[PDB]
Amino acid sequence: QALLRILKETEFKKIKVLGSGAFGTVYKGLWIPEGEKVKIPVAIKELREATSPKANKEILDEAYVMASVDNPHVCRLLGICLTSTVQLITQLMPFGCLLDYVREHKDNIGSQYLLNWCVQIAKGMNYLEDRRLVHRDLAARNVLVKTPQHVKITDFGRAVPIKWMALESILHRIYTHQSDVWSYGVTVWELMTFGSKPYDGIPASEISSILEKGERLPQPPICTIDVYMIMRKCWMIDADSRPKFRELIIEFSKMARDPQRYLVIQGDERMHLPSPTDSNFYRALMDEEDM
Amino acid sequence: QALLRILKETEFKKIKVLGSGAFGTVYKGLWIPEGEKVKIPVAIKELREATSPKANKEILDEAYVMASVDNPHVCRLLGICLTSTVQLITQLMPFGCLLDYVREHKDNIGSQYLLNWCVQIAKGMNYLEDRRLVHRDLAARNVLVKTPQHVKITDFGRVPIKWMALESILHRIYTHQSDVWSYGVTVWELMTFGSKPYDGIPASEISSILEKGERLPQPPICTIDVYMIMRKCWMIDADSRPKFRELIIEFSKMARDPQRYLVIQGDERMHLPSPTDSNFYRALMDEEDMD
Numbered sequence A: 001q002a003l004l005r006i007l008k009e010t011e012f013k014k015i016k017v018l019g020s021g022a023f024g025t026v027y028k029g030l031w032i033p034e035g036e037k038v039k040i041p042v043a044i045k046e047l048r049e050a051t052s053p054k055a056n057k058e059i060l061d062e063a064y065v066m067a068s069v070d071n072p073h074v075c076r077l078l079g080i081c082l083t084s085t086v087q088l089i090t091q092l093m094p095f096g097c098l099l100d101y102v103r104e105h106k107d108n109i110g111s112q113y114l115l116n117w118c119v120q121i122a123k124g125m126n127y128l129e130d131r132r133l134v135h136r137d138l139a140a141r142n143v144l145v146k147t148p149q150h151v152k153i154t155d156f157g158r159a160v161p162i163k164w165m166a167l168e169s170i171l172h173r174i175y176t177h178q179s180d181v182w183s184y185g186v187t188v189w190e191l192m193t194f195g196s197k198p199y200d201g202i203p204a205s206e207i208s209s210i211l212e213k214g215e216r217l218p219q220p221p222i223c224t225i226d227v228y229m230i231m232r233k234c235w236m237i238d239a240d241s242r243p244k245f246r247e248l249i250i251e252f253s254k255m256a257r258d259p260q261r262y263l264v265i266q267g268d269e270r271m272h273l274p275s276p277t278d279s280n281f282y283r284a285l286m287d288e289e290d291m
Numbered sequence B: 001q002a003l004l005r006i007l008k009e010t011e012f013k014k015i016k017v018l019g020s021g022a023f024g025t026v027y028k029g030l031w032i033p034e035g036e037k038v039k040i041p042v043a044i045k046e047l048r049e050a051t052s053p054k055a056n057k058e059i060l061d062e063a064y065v066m067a068s069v070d071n072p073h074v075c076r077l078l079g080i081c082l083t084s085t086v087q088l089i090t091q092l093m094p095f096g097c098l099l100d101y102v103r104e105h106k107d108n109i110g111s112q113y114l115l116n117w118c119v120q121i122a123k124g125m126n127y128l129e130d131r132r133l134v135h136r137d138l139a140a141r142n143v144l145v146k147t148p149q150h151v152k153i154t155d156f157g158r159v160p161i162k163w164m165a166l167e168s169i170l171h172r173i174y175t176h177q178s179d180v181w182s183y184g185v186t187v188w189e190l191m192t193f194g195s196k197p198y199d200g201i202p203a204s205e206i207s208s209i210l211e212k213g214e215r216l217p218q219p220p221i222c223t224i225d226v227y228m229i230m231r232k233c234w235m236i237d238a239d240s241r242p243k244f245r246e247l248i249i250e251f252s253k254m255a256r257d258p259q260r261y262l263v264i265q266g267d268e269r270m271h272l273p274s275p276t277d278s279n280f281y282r283a284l285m286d287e288e289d290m291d
């Protein structure tokens, strides 16, 4: 209700293209408050099409729900502008997404960051499950980095990412919170391989077959089997044998309490988490919300 | 101890001059974390005198206390860089200082902002008094605007003749009650929206006119209730001046009926923001807790 602000086109401008989503493009933009002199960096998503008083009504009423979330590991929709092209505005995460982050930082990611990222993603997904919100598009590209010690899940509930979807989602359009657990396992697979393309070299029209014959993503080199068994149980075809996000929070937390025991990274002992000094400095500059 | 980060000169640099004080220059600068690609805006104060490692320890020992404060209306020291000239790092407040703010928004400000700013400055000063920290240089230039609904006090802990209590001018005594005097001048600055106190009088003479009973005049928009409070901050007996806690209570009740205590032309179409615009401001700029 009061969590979604309706904007004018005059109080924000799109400045640089950051990327394409499925149904729209995301820009880096600037918010100019009315009667003010300051300019605040923001992220604007302009939708591919459809300005219709009628489609606006489902866009708005679902934007209200995406403005309702309150969790440190879930992004909140902040505003909307209902012109000819719908424009959506969120906070800009200056570090980008976890996917390009682990791809451009593959030689400096320690084990202790990866397991904490897995935990944080699970807390965000567990909160959405507690809010009865299905993500439907969880992937390393939809996990944003506020600080390297703080990731947030974005772009949930929007409803093709075939290589992330559960088989019941591929064959029968079923989207549950257990289907999201499947996409969570692929997301962990992306993190542990430092941004590899899942099922690389296999047409998306062919994934349903290989999953029915038992084929799964291979064990990442840095993962022990305790981590790989977790990923594989997120890919049981029976959805209720897949773990719950609540359980995934507990298990990855305990592995975070002994990181190099569960992830084997070359040179893992010269790369570590920030001290309280470095953490408090990050929070005072960029991350003042409670965590 | 772990709240003050020691920086290297390679991970931050100065970008633009924001203003000077007397102890040194303040710059707008950018922090680049080591091994990272993003650039985070900061405020850097360069100590314009070059100091020695012996003076550095006295600089450091007070920097730790300036990094120890935790209150929504007091700025916290975040970092320090100890080269030839010491550099000090805080959060950058993009709206600037309350002084230039009310000067550039003169008579576009309602009573409800003016009274809340008075409350917030008293809250910060009362927190400093509870920490047994004297400000010694309180003025509208040292009140930073994080957002228009949130101000913070900076540059405390250690000649502004026209702000000082009389015992500070004659006997250089600096108590929390001398800070109450300078608070009254600050409220005067806001209520005249950035006028020069005692404008046109040499500072070498302010002691004389204060012993003769002369004070700053009543601002046009102020009724006598608020002007009497300012006059009690300028009593020659230090223990007849009000306490900061009392100023919090007294300005708070006046804030609950602003148009009763300030008479501004057109005050009734300029209001405080709605929860929607406030939830929008904080999610972008002010994630800190606050009342």
Ligand SMILES: CN1CCC(c2ccc(-c3ccc4c(c3)C(=O)N([C@@H](C(=O)Nc3nccs3)c3cc(F)ccc3O)C4)cc2)CC1
Pocket: A026, A027, A043, A044, A045, A050, A055, A058, A059, A060, A062, A063, A066, A075, A076, A077, A078, A088, A089, A090, A154, A155, A156, A157, A158
């Ligand atoms: C006939 N036919 C036509 C179309 C109809 C339709 C209905 C609803 C939408 C809709 C509504 C709301 C959103 C989204 C989509 C969405 O993509 N949204 C993201 C988000 O915007 N991200 C951002 N990136 C950068 C800046 S804004 C998002 C942000 C966030 F903070 C939290 C969750 C979230 O999903 C929000 C579109 C089309 C359906 C029927």
Ligand SMILES: CN1CCC(c2ccc(-c3ccc4c(c3)C(=O)N([C@@H](C(=O)Nc3nccs3)c3cc(F)ccc3O)C4)cc2)CC1
Pocket: B023, B026, B027, B043, B044, B045, B051, B055, B058, B059, B060, B062, B063, B066, B075, B076, B077, B078, B088, B089, B090, B154, B155, B156, B157
């Ligand atoms: C002969 N000579 C030799 C050396 C001796 C000496 C001793 C102590 C200092 C010292 C130490 C610490 C600070 C300050 C000064 C100061 O000016 N500081 C502000 C502050 O940094 N402001 C900012 N603006 C923009 C970016 S940083 C500040 C920031 C904050 F967040 C909270 C309180 C505060 O006071 C902090 C300097 C010199 C004195 C005698």
Ligand SMILES: */C=C/C(=O)Nc1cc(Nc2nccc(-c3cn(C)c4ccccc34)n2)c(OC)cc1N(C)CCN(C)C
Pocket: A017, A018, A019, A020, A021, A026, A028, A043, A090, A091, A092, A093, A094, A095, A096, A097, A098, A099, A100, A141, A144, A154, A155
């Ligand atoms: C991971 C892809 C990407 O482009 N990442 C990225 C993201 C930045 N910030 C940001 N903040 C909030 C929301 C998004 C966002 C949300 N969705 C659904 C997106 C889709 C596509 C792109 C971005 C999306 N992003 C960011 O801030 C500067 C930069 C950035 N990078 C690394 C791209 C480099 N360009 C500057 C060329």
Ligand SMILES: C=CC(=O)Nc1cc(Nc2nccc(-c3cn(C)c4ccccc34)n2)c(OC)cc1N(C)CCN(C)C
Pocket: B018, B019, B020, B021, B026, B028, B043, B090, B091, B092, B093, B094, B095, B096, B097, B098, B099, B100, B141, B144, B154, B155
């Ligand atoms: C009233 C002086 C002042 O504070 N000016 C100021 C400040 C900031 N940001 C900022 N953030 C933290 C600390 C300080 C700061 C602290 N001190 C002690 C200062 C002394 C002089 C100038 C600035 C400072 N300044 C800031 O962020 C962009 C902008 C301005 N300006 C008003 C510049 C003028 N603008 C209208 C173009």
